[PDB]
């Protein structure tokens, strides 16, 4: 009879218990306390403007229909017991396709104390929308939100709250960062209100702030363009009689930039405006294209006014490298102070 | 108190027959729809479909679910929807749709004292619309969503938009990366199949594409390559090997863009706007390579006459390509 004592208690609670009605129906507002444990902040899918996150979604409310006086004080029960009682129908407003893991069993936890206070956590994987303004790409930052609330109960019936001070009510595991190109700088925890065609609902919101790491784009995009620009400006120092040589320099380098200009569109998501990377590519396209133009002008004046042709060729050894140096300093100081 | 509410709800479901629609054997049951579009994303040209997320609301009156003495709107648990009659509304032009189930099955049942029922779902669907890409990307589309009753004909069920033209809300808060929603419309009509006439509601958007993206990706890369071929006409032909050996590389480079532009769009047996421009730019860079070979062929036979051609090439080629853009943009806008 070590367990039949608890079997009588459990059968006593569920006897005459209707799970279709929230606690305190028509008498007060059911109050739910929530807190999250981010076990791993997953990758951010830039081309879909989303991200992934795995949480220990914890909830807690109070139901007076589940009071008992047993040998123990807390009943750590099976996950099956959850479906026998009323639980909040919390959902994520901006989620896209979430997963409630149930391997090898439904990853849920239910505990009942002697005063009716319930604790009900679960393990979730959430894919949430994150709008992104890629105007400052690849030096952009973002504030990806995560909003959750009740689906069927208005704020006159069910209200949500944070378990502790809101800053400490969402915790991130130290080693959970699965991010590759971003860098989670911190989060802010807030609460709000929404109004729909059915009524007003309480919404609990969490914002995660990310900053992109531009290290990957320095090596694949920015460095090849700089080398191509420097490669083209080699053509100035060649003697004027190497007409086939400089022509190969001028034509080929501009073709290389077109290759690079298209090759940047792969990692780049499709957006209407022009990112900060395209300005660097566009200007680097003009510089190499101007070098080809300058040679033709020098070649044109040859055999007619050679002194003028040599006069211009000296300047292009100065203006082109110096202007490209001035352009880089403005570009790399404008966007790093944002 | 709360026990009395349990008794009232329990009595309603005692003897309730889920197999029979309300007013069975009598007048048809009227059902009103409300859609609250949450987001539209992934308007795919290759698959010719789009993804839609929305809050689908249905309104109907079942006299068997009327209670008295409780001045409230009973918002019951979403699991009680398995013990009631609900319309068999389906989406005809949907390919793969699902109802979100986190943390529970997103669903709402909300009774009213007079028997009215409000039934809400949060549905994400991938409905299919056929796209006419003849003027791509300077094109407009008309992607629809067909709402229909499967097993009930107009003698048993009737659909109507609840609130008239205010039934669908939230369209104006949608920011498609490439498209821009111009207009949405609501239609109610009947469709006749081999098994009877069924009611149908329709929702359609008229998307218009944004050209600003293809300027940086297709036209500007193509135009600049065309300009490069013209630079060959200001270079003296003394570089006998260079001009021909680089004109060929420009033509080669042009085809590379075309190769990576057929991957962007599906396989269709006609010529779009983007193909005409690429073909047009291909001809101009093709003539330039053909032009130099003619000059290089007689670079020594008649050098005085060969140099005269390059004088006109400096003018005829730039002017003709300006004519081509004149005709092209006027016809397609």
């Amino acid at each position: 009879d070590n367990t039949t004592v608890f079997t009588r208690i459990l059968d006593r609670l569920l006897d005459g218990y209707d799970n279709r009605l929230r606690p305190g129906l028509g008498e007060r507002v059911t109050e739910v306390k929530t807190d999250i444990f981010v076990t791993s902040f997953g990758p951010v899918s830039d081309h879909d403007m989303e991200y992934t996150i795995d949480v220990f979604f914890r909830q807690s409310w109070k139901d007076e229909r589940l009071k008992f006086k047993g040998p123990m004080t807390v009943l750590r029960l099976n996950n099956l017991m959850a479906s026998k009682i009323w639980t909040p129908d919390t959902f994520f407003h901006n989620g896209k396709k979430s997963v409630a893991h149930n391997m090898t069993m439904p990853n849920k936890l239910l505990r009942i104390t002697e005063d009716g206070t319930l604790l009900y956590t679960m393990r979730l994987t959430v894919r949430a929308e994150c709008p992104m303004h890629l105007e400052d790409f690849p030096m952009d930052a973002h504030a990806c939100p995560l909003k959750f609330g009740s689906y069927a109960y208005t704020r006159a019936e069910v209200v949500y709250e944070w378990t502790r001070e809101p800053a400490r009510s969402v915790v991130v595991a130290e080693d959970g960062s699965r991010l590759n190109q971003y860098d989670l700088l911190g989060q802010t925890v807030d609460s709000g209100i929404v109004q729909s065609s059915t009524g007003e609902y309480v919404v609990m919101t969490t914002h995660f702030h990310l900053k992109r790491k531009i290290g990957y784009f320095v090596i694949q995009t920015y460095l090849p363009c700089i080398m191509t620009v420097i490669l083209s400006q080699v053509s100035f120092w060649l003697n004027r009689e190497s007409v086939p040589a400089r022509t190969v320099f001028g034509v080929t380098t501009v073709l290389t930039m077109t290759t690079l200009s298209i090759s940047a569109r792969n990692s780049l998501p499709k957006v209407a405006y022009a990112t900060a990377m395209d300005w660097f590519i566009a200007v680097c396209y003009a510089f190499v294209f101007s070098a080809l133009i300058e040679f033709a002008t020098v070649n044109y004046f040859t055999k007619s006014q050679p002194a003028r042709a040599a006069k211009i060729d000296r300047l292009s050894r100065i203006a082109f490298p110096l202007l490209f140096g001035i352009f880089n300093l403005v570009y790399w100081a404008t966007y790093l102070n944002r | 108190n709360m026990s009395f509410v349990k008794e009232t709800v329990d009595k309603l479901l005692k003897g309730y027959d889920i197999r029979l629609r309300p007013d069975f054997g009598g007048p048809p049951v009227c059902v009103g729809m409300n859609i609250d579009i949450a987001s539209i994303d992934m308007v795919s040209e290759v698959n010719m479909d789009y993804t839609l997320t929305m809050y689908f609301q249905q309104y109907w009156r079942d006299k068997r679910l009327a209670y008295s003495g409780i001045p409230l709107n009973l918002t019951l648990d979403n699991r009680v929807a398995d013990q009631l009659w609900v319309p068999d509304t389906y989406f005809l032009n949907d390919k793969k749709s699902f109802v979100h189930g986190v943390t529970v099955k997103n669903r709402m049942i909300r009774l009213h004292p007079d028997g009215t029922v409000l039934y809400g779902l949060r549905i994400t669907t991938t409905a299919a619309c056929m796209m006419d890409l003849r003027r791509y990307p300077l094109d407009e589309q008309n992607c629809t969503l067909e709402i229909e009753s499967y097993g009930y004909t107009t003698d048993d069920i009737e659909f109507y938009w609840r609130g008239g033209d205010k039934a669908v809300t939230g369209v104006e808060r949608i920011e498609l990366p490439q498209f821009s929603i111009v207009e949405h419309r609501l239609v109610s009509r009947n469709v006749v199949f081999a098994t009877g006439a069924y009611p149908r509601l329709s929702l359609s958007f008229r998307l218009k594409r944004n050209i600003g993206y293809f300027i940086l990706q297709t036209y500007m890369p193509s135009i600049l390559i065309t300009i490069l071929s013209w630079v060959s006409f200001w270079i003296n032909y003394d570089a006998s090997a260079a001009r021909v050996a680089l004109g060929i590389t420009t033509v080669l480079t042009m085809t590379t863009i075309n190769t990576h532009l057929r991957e962007t769009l599906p396989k269709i047996p006609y010529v779009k706007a983007i193909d005409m421009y690429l073909m047009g730019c291909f001809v101009f860079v093709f003539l330039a390579l053909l032009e130099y070979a003619f000059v290089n062929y007689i670079f020594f036979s008649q050098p005085a006459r060969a140099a005269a051609i390059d004088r006109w090439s400096r003018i005829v080629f730039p002017f003709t390509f300006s004519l081509f853009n004149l005709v092209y943009w006027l016809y397609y806008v």
Epitope: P131, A143, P145, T205 | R173, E175
Partner: nanobody, 123 residues
Framework: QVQLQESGGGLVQAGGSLRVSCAAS????????MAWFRQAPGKEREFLAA???????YYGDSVRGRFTISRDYAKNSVDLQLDGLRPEDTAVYYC?????????????????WGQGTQVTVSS
């Protein structure tokens, strides 16, 4: 050029409604957060309300339950309904739009700022 022009406001006597609007121009702020900031005379700039793309309404810890924020996404504007005004509400009201980086309640997270509107409440 993006300009946030604000209208409405004025002088009211110890209560009564006073609706303040803010019409944006030069950019589509559908994807941004549009907020309202109040700068009391000499004290500091304070947060009042905000509303993101999802129509989630945030309010300050003080003016909650008194002011109502509402956005008209089609016309690219955000209003603010002031009700039950107290004499200590007299200040300059500002209109802001931003992405809410490092918190949406922080004045430093809004790139675009309005020019201010004067509201005076007399006993």
């Amino acid at each position: 050029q993006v300009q946030l022009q604000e209208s409405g406001g004025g002088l009211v006597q110890a209560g009564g409604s006073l609706r303040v609007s803010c019409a944006a121009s030069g950019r589509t702020f559908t994807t941004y957060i549009m907020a309202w900031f109040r700068q009391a005379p000499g004290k500091e700039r304070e947060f009042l309300a905000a509303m993101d793309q999802g129509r989630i309404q945030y309010y300050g810890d003080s003016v909650r339950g008194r002011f109502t924020i509402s956005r008209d996404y089609a016309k690219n504007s955000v209003d603010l309904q002031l009700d039950g005004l107290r004499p200590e509400d007299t200040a300059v009201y500002y209109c802001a739009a931003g992405a809410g980086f490092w918190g949406l309640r922080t004045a430093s997270s809004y790139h675009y700022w309005g020019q201010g509107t004067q509201v005076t409440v007399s006993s």
